[PDB]
Short mmCIF file of C-alpha atoms and ligand atoms in Angstrom, two decimals:
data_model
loop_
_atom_site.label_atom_id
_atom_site.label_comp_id
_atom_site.label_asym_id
_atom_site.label_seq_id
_atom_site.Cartn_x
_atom_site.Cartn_y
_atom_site.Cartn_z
CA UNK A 1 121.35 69.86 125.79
CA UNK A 2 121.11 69.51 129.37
CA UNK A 3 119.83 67.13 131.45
CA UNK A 4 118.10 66.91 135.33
CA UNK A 5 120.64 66.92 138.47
CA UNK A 6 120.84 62.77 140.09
CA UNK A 7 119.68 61.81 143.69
CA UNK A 8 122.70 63.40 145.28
CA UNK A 9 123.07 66.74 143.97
CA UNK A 10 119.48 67.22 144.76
CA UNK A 11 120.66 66.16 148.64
CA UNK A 12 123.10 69.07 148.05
CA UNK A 13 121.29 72.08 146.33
CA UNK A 14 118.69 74.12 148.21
CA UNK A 15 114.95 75.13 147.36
CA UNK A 16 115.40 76.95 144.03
CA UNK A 17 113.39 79.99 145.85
CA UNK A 18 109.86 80.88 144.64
CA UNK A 19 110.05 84.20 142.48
CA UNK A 20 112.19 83.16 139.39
CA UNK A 21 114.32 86.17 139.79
CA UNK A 22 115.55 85.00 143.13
CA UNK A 23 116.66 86.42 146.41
CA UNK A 24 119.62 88.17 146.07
CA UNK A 25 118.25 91.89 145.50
CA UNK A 26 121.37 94.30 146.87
CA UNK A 27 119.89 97.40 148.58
CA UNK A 28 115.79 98.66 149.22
CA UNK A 29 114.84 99.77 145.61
CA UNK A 30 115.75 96.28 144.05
CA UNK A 31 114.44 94.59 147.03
CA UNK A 32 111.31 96.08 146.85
CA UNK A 33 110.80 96.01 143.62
CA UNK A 34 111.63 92.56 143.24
CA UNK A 35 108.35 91.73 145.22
CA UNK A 36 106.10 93.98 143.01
CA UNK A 37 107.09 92.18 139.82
CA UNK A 38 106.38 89.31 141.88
CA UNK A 39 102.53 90.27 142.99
CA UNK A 40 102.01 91.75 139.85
CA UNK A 41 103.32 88.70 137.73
CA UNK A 42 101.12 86.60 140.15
CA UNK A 43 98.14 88.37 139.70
CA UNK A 44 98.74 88.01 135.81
CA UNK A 45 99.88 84.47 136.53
CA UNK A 46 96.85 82.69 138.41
CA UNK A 47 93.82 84.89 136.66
CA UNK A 48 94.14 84.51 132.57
CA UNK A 49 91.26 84.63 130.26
CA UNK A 50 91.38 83.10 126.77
CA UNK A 51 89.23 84.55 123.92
CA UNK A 52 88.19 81.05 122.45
CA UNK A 53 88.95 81.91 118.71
CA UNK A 54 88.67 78.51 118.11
CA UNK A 55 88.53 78.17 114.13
CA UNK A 56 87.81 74.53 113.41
CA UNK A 57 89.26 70.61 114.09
CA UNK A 58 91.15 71.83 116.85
CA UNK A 59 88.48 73.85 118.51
CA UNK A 60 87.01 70.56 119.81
CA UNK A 61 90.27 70.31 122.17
CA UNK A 62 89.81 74.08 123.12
CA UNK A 63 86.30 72.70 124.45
CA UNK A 64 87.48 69.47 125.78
CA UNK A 65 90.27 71.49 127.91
CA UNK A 66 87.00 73.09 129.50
CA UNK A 67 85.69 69.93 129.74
CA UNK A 68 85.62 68.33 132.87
CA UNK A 69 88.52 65.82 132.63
CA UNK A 70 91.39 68.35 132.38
CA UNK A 71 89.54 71.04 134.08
CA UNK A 72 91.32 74.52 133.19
CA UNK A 73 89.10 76.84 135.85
CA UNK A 74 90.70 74.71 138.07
CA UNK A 75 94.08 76.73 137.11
CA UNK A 76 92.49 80.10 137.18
CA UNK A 77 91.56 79.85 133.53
CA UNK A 78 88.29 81.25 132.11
CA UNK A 79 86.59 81.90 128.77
CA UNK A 80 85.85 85.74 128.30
CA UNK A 81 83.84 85.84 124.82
CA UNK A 82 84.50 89.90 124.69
CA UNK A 83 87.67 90.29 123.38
CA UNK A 84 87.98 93.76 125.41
CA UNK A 85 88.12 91.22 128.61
CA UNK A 86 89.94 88.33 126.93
CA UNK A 87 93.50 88.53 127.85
CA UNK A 88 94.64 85.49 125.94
CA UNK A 89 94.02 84.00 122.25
CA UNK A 90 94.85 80.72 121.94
CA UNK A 91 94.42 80.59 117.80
CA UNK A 92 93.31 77.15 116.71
CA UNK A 93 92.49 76.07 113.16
CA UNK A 94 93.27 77.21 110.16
CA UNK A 95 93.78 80.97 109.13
CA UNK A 96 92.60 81.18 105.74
CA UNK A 97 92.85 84.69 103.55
CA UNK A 98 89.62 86.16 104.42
CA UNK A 99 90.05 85.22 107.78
CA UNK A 100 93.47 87.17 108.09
CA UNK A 101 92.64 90.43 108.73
CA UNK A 102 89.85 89.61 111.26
CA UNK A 103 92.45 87.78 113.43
CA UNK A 104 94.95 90.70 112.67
CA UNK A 105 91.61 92.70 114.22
CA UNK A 106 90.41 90.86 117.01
CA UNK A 107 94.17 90.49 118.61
CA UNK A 108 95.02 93.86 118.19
CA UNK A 109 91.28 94.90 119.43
CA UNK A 110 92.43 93.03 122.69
CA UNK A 111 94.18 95.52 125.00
CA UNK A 112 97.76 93.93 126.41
CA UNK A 113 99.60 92.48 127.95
CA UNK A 114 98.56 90.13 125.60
CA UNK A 115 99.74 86.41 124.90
CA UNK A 116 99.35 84.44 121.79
CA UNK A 117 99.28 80.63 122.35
CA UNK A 118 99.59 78.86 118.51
CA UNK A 119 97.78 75.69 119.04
CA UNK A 120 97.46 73.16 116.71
CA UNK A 121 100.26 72.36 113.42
CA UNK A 122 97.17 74.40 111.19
CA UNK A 123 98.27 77.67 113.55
CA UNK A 124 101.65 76.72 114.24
CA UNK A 125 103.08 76.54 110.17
CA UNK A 126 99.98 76.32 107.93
CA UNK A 127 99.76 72.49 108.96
CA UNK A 128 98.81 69.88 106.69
CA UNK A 129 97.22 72.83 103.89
CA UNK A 130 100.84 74.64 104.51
CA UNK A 131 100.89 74.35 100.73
CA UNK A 132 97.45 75.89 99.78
CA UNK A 133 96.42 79.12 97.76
CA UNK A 134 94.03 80.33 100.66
CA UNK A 135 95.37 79.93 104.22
CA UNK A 136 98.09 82.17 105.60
CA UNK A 137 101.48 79.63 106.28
CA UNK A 138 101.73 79.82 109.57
CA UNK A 139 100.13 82.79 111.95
CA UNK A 140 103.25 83.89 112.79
CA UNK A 141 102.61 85.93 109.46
CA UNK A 142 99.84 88.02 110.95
CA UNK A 143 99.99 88.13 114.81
CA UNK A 144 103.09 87.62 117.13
CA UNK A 145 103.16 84.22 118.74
CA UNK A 146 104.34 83.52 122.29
CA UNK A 147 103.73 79.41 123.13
CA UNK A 148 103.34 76.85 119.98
CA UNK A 149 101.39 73.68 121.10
CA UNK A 150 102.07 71.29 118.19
CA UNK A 151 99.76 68.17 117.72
CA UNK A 152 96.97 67.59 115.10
CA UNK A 153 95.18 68.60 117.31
CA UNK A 154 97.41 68.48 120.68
CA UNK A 155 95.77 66.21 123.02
CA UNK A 156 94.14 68.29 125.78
CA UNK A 157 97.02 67.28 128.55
CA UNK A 158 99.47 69.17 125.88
CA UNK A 159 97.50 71.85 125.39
CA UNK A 160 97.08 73.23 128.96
CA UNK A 161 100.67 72.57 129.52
CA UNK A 162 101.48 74.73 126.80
CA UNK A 163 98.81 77.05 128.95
CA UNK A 164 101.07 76.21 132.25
CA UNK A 165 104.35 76.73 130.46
CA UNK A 166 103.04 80.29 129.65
CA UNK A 167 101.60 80.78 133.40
CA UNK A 168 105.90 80.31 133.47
CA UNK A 169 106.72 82.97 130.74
CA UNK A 170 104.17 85.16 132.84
CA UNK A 171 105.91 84.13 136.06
CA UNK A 172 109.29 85.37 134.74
CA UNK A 173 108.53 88.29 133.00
CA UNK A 174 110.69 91.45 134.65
CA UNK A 175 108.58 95.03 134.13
CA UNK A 176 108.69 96.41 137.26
CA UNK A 177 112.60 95.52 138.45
CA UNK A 178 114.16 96.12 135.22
CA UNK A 179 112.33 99.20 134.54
CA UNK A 180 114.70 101.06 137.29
CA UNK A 181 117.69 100.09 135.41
CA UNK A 182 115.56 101.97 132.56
CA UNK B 1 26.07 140.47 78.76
CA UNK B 2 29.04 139.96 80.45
CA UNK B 3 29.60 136.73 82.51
CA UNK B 4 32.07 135.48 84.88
CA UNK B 5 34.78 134.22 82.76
CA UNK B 6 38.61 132.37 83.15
CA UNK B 7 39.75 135.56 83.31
CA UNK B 8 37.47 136.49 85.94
CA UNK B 9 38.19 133.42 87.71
CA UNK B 10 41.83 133.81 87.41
CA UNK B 11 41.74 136.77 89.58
CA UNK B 12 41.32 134.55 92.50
CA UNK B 13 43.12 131.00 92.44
CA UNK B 14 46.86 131.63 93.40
CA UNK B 15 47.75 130.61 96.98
CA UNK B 16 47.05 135.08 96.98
CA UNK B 17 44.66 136.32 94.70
CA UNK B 18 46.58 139.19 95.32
CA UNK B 19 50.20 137.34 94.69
CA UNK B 20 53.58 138.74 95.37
CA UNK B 21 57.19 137.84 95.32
CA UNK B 22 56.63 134.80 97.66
CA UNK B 23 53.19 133.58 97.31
CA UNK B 24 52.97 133.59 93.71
CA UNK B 25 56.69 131.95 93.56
CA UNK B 26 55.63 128.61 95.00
CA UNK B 27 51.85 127.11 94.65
CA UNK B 28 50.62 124.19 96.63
CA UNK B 29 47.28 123.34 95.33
CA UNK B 30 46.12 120.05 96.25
CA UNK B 31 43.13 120.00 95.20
CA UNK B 32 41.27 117.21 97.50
CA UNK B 33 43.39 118.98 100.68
CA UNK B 34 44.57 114.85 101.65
CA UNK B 35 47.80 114.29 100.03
CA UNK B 36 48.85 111.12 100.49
CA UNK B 37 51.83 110.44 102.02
CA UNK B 38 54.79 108.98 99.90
CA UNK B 39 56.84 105.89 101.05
CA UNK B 40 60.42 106.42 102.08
CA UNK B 41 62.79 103.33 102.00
CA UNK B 42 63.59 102.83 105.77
CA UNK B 43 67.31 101.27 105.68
CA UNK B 44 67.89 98.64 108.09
CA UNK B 45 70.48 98.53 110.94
CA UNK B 46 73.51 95.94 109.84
CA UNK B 47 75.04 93.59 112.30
CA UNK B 48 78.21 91.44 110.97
CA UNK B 49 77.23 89.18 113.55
CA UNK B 50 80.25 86.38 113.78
CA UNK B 51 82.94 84.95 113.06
CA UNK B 52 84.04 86.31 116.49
CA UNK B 53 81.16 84.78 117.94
CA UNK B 54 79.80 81.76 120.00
S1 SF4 C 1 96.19 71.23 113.21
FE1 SF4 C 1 95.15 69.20 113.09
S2 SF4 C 1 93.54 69.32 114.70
FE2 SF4 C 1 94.21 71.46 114.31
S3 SF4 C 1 92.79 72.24 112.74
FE3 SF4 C 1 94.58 71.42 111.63
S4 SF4 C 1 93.99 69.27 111.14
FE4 SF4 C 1 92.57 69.97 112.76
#
């Protein structure tokens, strides 16, 4: 475990830079592509579009996140019903047996880059019907998850964290710059 | 005397009176000339509208 710097080393340390991979590129081609990653992962970054799956119980804080008290436009964030446009699913709500291989459809349906955001403890391990003959434990067992959001439901203000903390993840990811060591 | 019999009347009343291979083969004699048409079963178009659905 670690734990934030006090007053004084603050005083000491400089901006931590913008782009997450830093500014310390050594010649043109890892210069240059070192800002490329850095459009690109903005443009993926500011504009994401969730497919509102939206199952049950927690769908009502998938709609409350749209809502006007947490607004999530505001971010960049907008709710594509096509799935061919969607380039998000934040599964909510339970995943029982006949709905397993629709989800297993309608993610893999979705073009990528594609991120999975687990909301909900129903999503996350099964939740509280974890030990149930119909609903899959967990949708980790049909889909690849990237963010888990736990709550019963998460309150809104955890949820689009969890959506921030992925903007993050999307921030950081290295295509482009790591592809020429490829 | 000698009148106009089945026989007679059979020498006419294939789709040839004079039938061959073809005509004599098949025969479509209705009668009345209006056939009525015959119902067909017109199968619908199938939409699994939801789940993935507002
Ligand atoms: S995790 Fe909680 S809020 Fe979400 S569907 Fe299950 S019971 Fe409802």
């Amino acid at each position: 475990q670690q734990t934030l710097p006090v007053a004084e080393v603050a005083q000491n340390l400089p901006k931590k830079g913008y782009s997450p991979f830093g500014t310390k590129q050594s010649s043109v081609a890892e210069w240059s592509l070192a800002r490329l990653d850095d459009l690109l992962n903005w443009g993926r970054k500011g504009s994401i579009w969730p497919l509102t799956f939206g199952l049950a119980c927690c769908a009502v804080e998938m709609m409350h996140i749209a809502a006007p008290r947490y607004d999530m436009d505001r971010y960049g964030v907008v709710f594509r019903a096509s799935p061919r446009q969607a380039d998000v699913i934040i599964v909510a709500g339970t995943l029982t047996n006949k709905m397993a291989p629709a989800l297993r459809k309608v993610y893999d349906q979705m073009p990528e880059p594609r991120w999975v955001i687990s909301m909900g403890s129903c999503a996350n391990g099964g939740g509280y019907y974890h030990y149930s003959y119909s609903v899959v434990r967990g949708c980790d067992r049909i889909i690849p998850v990237d963010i888990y959001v736990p709550g019963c439901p998460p309150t809104a203000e955890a949820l689009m964290y969890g959506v921030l903390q992925l903007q993050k993840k999307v921030k950081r990811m290295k295509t482009l710059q790591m592809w020429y060591r490829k | 005397k000698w009148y106009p019999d089945p026989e007679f009347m059979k020498q006419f009343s294939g789709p040839v009176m004079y039938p061959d291979e073809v005509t004599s083969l098949w025969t479509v004699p209705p009668w009345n000339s209006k056939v009525t048409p015959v119902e067909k079963s017109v199968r619908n178009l199938t939409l699994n509208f939801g789940p993935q659905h507002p």
